[PDB]
Amino acid sequence: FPQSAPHGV
Amino acid sequence: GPHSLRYFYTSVSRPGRGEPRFLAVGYVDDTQFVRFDSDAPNPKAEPRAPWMQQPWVEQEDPEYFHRSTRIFKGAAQIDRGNLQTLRGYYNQSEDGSHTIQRMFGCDLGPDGRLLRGYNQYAYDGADYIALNEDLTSWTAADMAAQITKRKWEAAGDAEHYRSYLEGLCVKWLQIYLDKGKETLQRADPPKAHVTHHPVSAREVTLRCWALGFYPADISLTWQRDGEDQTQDMELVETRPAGDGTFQKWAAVGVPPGEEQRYTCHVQHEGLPEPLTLKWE
Amino acid sequence: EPRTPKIQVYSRHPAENGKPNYLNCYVYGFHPPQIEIDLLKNGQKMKTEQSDLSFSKDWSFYLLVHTDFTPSTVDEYSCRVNHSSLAAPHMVKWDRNN
């Protein structure tokens, strides 16, 4: 089950 | 034994050719189970193992794919921003293609608790930023990634990864290992044979084959009269058969007549005991 | 500084002239991810399937390219790979012993 970073680099 | 859940995010810019493309794949151990591609017409998370195509999925979460879809579209959007900002950090032209990769997931102990989390990034194939095993500080690889570290540390981003790992990550890995038991835990041994390939008067190649084994992990070695020849044997990388098993071989050139002095050794978690075998 | 792909061309099962099999071209350890991988019969492009792009601990990519085939004494099979790391396309002959 996946996850995306809260903020951009 | 020690299992892993890993997602692999790749985004690639294509100056002129249009918007960046984003690809994701999920693996449990050596077994792929999902994929995502921002270039597919109506792009969704897609099962890519049989045991992801089965009613248990609906039953545990009926929104499984819609949610995974949502998250991949997010990751895809964020990476389009990452590719712009990384150009800036590195003071790069708009002209060249660049690549952002992310690899993240968790390992489980035989305890079956979280052993270890990963969350790491590469830019153009080189180490950029990784979450440390404290799960609170980042290792920046260079002075661009240091900006990212200062930013992420100040905003406490690490915390949102922590709770995904301690919450969802372990949780779903156990679900997968349970429901995918016949594929993921049920470990096929290598079927091993030796083949004999003349080259000249001086050398016959003895090639030890290991076929149809899962997982990929294996040790394949020749010994002459109990003495390892690893420094003087040819050993290809483990390669997929295409059916979810792996292949490997190890070859040694021996004098003709000497064939019964060589024993091939095969060790794999799927063998009751290590295989030893010889020519014919 | 691109990384040069490694190439293995091999069948799913041991080759028997006449028996339908699966021809595989595994190409791994490359960067960047843009790559041309074809399977060739007598030097002509076959219809293939490609795995979903993935990568290893060291960030190098790997793909598997495969199709149905039937080995025969008359026919040559090869894998053609072109990548930014290569001066020009490399071809690797299918040998049943490989």
Residue numbers in the entry:
A (entry chain C): 1 to 9
B (entry chain A): 1 to 280
C (entry chain B): 1 to 98
Provide the authors' own sentences about this structure as they appear in the paper.
Bats possess distinctive characteristic in their MHC-I molecule, with prevalent 3- or 5-amino acid (3AA or 5AA) insertions at the N-terminal end of the peptide binding groove (PBG), which may generate a unique antiviral immune response. Mylu-B*67:01 contains the most common 5AA insertion sequence, MQQPW, and also exhibits the D61/R67 pairing.
Among these three peptides, P1-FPQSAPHGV exhibited highest refolding efficiency and ultimately successfully formed crystals in complex with Mylu-B*67:01 (pMylu-B*67:01-P1). The crystal structures of the pMylu-B*67:01-P1 complex achieves a resolution of 2.2 Å. The crystal structure of pMylu-B*67:01-P1 unveils the intriguing consequences of the MQQPW insertion, forming an additional delicate helix nestled between the 310 Helix and α1 helix of HC. The inserted MQQPW resides at the junction of the 310 Helix and the emerging helix, creating a dainty loop connecting these two helical structures. The MQQPW insertion maintains a considerable distance from the peptide and does not engage in direct interactions. The presence of the R67 side chain induces the closure of the A pocket, thereby obstructing the exposure of the P1-F side chain. Notably, despite the close proximity of D61 and R67, no salt bridge was formed between them. The MQQPW insertion is precisely located within the 310 helix region, which is the most unstable part of the α-helix structure of the MHC-I molecule. In Mylu-B*67:01, there are a total of 12 intra-chain hydrogen bonds in this region to maintain the structure, whereas in Mylu-B*67:01ΔMQQPW, there are only four hydrogen bonds. The conformation of W52 changes significantly during peptide exchange, suggesting that improving the stability of W52 contributes to the stabilization of the complex.
